[PDB]
C-alpha cells in the first residue's frame, strides 16, 4: 500500500510498537492482559473487563495479571489477539489493521507453529497486505549501523546470541536458553519468600519486577561475596511498607550466569556467547570477540558488563581484544532497527504479500523468514 508499515517489537515483556521511519517507538506498553478479579457493585465503574496498556498499570489491584507470551512462545492466542487489536485501536494507533504492512519481531529458534499461527492471525483475523516476521539480532545490528558483531540480548524471557559476520548469519551457532528477566523475577520472588516478605498475587509479581529493576546489582565475585555480609539496604513498596532486601539483591540476578539455581541444567549468558562464538569458524572469532553487541532489558543490571568481561576473559583465549558494545537506547534498539529496515525501498521485496499467503500459506512464511 502507499502508506507506511508498522514495526511491532513483539517482545515478551514490553510489546513496543509504532510506525516505520520513526526514531523512538511512540507506544510502549507491557505485554499482559488485565481481567478484574473482584465484582463491580457501584454503578459508573470501569467497563470492558480486558485492560491493556496504561489502564492495567494505573489500576493493578483490580485486575489479575496474565501473560500471553511465556518464554517467547505465545500461549494464549486470544490474549495476543486482544493485545494486537489494542495496538490497532484508537487508544494506541487509530489506524486500520488492513491498510499497512506489519514488521513483527520474533526471537530466534522459536517453534514453527508460532510463525504459522501468528501469520494466520495477521492474515485471517486481520487482513494485512504484507507481513514479514524477523529476527531481533539482525534488527539490532540494523539500528547500530554495524554489519558484524555478536548480538547477545536478554529480553524478558529469551536469551540468545546470534553471531553475524557482514550479513552472513550462521544458523548453527545460534544458542538460545529460556532463562531471562521474567524467570529471574520469579526466582527473586522465591528469594523474597525465603527472606520473609511473601508476594503471591499476580498483581504483586509486577511489584517484584520493580524490585528486580531497582536494587539488584551483579557482583563480580560470586562466592567471595556470597560468604560475606552486606549492609542490607532498604526498599519502599508502593504501599509504603519498608523492606530490607538482604542478600537476594545479588544472589537473584546470578541466575543469568548460573542456571543451576533455578534447577535446570543449561548454560549461562557468558557460556551462550562463548559457545556461539566458538561454534563459528577459526577466521571469524577474533572479529566477533572484538564485536559484541548487547541488547535486551535484562542486561541493564549493575555490573553486568564487568562480569561479562571477567567471564569472557576466563573463557576466551589469551591476548584477544574483547569489546562489548552496547547502545544507549538498549530497550528500543530492536524497534529502531525495525524502523530502519521497514523504511527501506528494498523492504517491499522481502515481505510476504497477501496474495502469496493466499496462494501458498505456511510454506511462503517459512520461505521468506529466517
Amino acid at each position: 500500500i502507499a502508506n507506511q508499515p508498522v514495526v511491532i517489537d513483539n517482545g515478551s515483556g514490553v510489546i513496543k510498537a509504532g510506525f516505520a521511519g520513526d526514531q523512538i517507538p511512540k507506544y510502549c506498553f507491557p505485554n499482559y492482559v488485565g481481567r478484574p478479579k473482584h465484582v463491580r457493585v457501584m454503578a459508573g465503574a470501569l467497563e470492558g473487563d480486558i485492560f491493556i496498556g496504561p489502564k492495567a498499570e494505573e489500576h493493578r489491584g483490580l485486575l489479575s495479571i496474565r501473560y500471553p507470551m511465556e518464554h517467547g512462545i505465545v500461549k494464549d492466542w486470544n490474549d495476543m489477539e486482544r493485545i494486537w487489536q489494542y495496538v490497532y485501536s484508537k487508544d494506541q494507533l487509530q489506524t486500520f489493521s488492513e491498510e499497512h504492512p506489519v514488521l513483527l519481531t520474533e526471537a530466534p529458534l522459536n517453534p514453527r507453529k508460532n510463525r504459522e499461527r501468528a501469520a494466520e492471525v495477521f492474515f485471517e483475523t486481520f487482513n494485512v497486505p504484507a507481513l514479514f516476521i524477523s529476527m531481533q539480532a539482525v534488527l539490532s545490528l540494523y539500528a547500530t549501523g554495524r554489519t558484524t558483531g555478536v548480538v547477545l540480548d536478554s529480553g524478558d524471557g529469551v536469551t540468545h546470541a546470534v553471531p553475524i559476520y557482514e550479513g552472513f548469519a550462521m544458523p548453527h551457532s545460534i544458542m538460545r536458553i529460556d532463562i531471562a528477566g521474567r524467570d529471574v523475577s520469579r526466582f527473586l520472588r522465591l528469594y523474597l519468600r525465603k527472606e520473609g516478605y511473601d508476594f503471591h498475587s499476580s498483581s504483586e509479581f509486577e511489584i517484584v519486577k520493580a524490585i528486580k529493576e531497582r536494587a539488584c546489582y551483579l557482583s563480580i565475585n560470586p562466592q567471595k561475596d556470597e560468604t560475606l555480609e552486606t549492609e542490607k539496604a532498604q526498599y519502599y513498596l508502593p504501599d509504603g511498607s519498608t523492606i530490607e532486601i538482604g542478600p537476594s539483591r545479588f544472589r537473584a540476578p546470578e541466575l543469568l550466569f548460573r542456571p543451576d539455581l533455578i534447577g535446570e541444567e543449561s548454560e549461562g549468558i557468558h557460556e551462550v556467547l562463548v559457545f556461539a562464538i566458538q561454534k563459528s569458524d577459526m577466521d571469524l572469532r577474533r572479529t566477533l570477540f572484538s564485536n559484541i553487541v548487547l541488547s535486551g532489558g535484562s542486561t541493564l543490571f549493575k555490573g553486568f558488563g564487568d562480569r561479562l568481561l571477567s567471564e569472557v576473559k576466563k573463557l576466551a583465549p589469551k591476548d584477544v581484544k574483547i569489546r562489548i558494545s552496547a547502545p544507549q537506547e538498549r530497550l528500543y534498539s530492536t524497534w529502531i532497527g525495525g524502523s530502519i529496515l521497514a523504511s527501506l525501498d528494498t523492504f517491499k521485496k522481502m515481505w510476504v504479500s497477501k496474495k502469496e499467503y493466499e496462494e501458498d500459506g505456511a510454506r511462503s512464511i517459512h520461505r521468506k523468514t529466517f
Binding site: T144, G305, Q328, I340, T346, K349
Partner: protein, 75 residues
C-alpha cells in the same frame, strides 16, 4: 445547604476533611561496555542504497540443492 434546618442531627462546626500534611539510569555509565549513541538518520543513510535480491530463495528445511543461501542479489 438547607439540610441543616430541616434535619435534626446534621450538626455544624464539622471539619469535613481530617487530613495529614501533604509532605513533598546509573547503569549505562560503565567502563566495560562502549556505549554507542543510536542514530536512525546515519544508519538509514548508510543502508539507503543497498538492495536485496530474493529471486528463488528458501529458509525452510527443504533439502534439494546442496546448500541454501537466501538473499542473493543486490545493486
Amino acid at each position: 445547604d438547607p439540610k441543616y434546618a430541616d434535619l435534626p442531627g446534621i450538626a455544624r462546626n464539622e471539619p469535613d476533611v481530617y487530613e495529614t500534611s501533604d509532605l513533598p539510569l546509573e547503569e549505562l555509565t560503565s567502563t566495560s561496555v562502549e556505549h554507542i549513541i543510536v542514530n536512525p538518520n546515519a544508519a538509514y543513510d548508510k543502508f539507503k542504497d543497498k538492495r536485496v535480491g530474493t529471486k528463488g530463495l528458501d529458509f525452510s528445511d527443504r533439502i534439494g540443492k546442496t546448500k541454501r543461501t537466501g538473499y542473493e542479489s543486490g545493486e
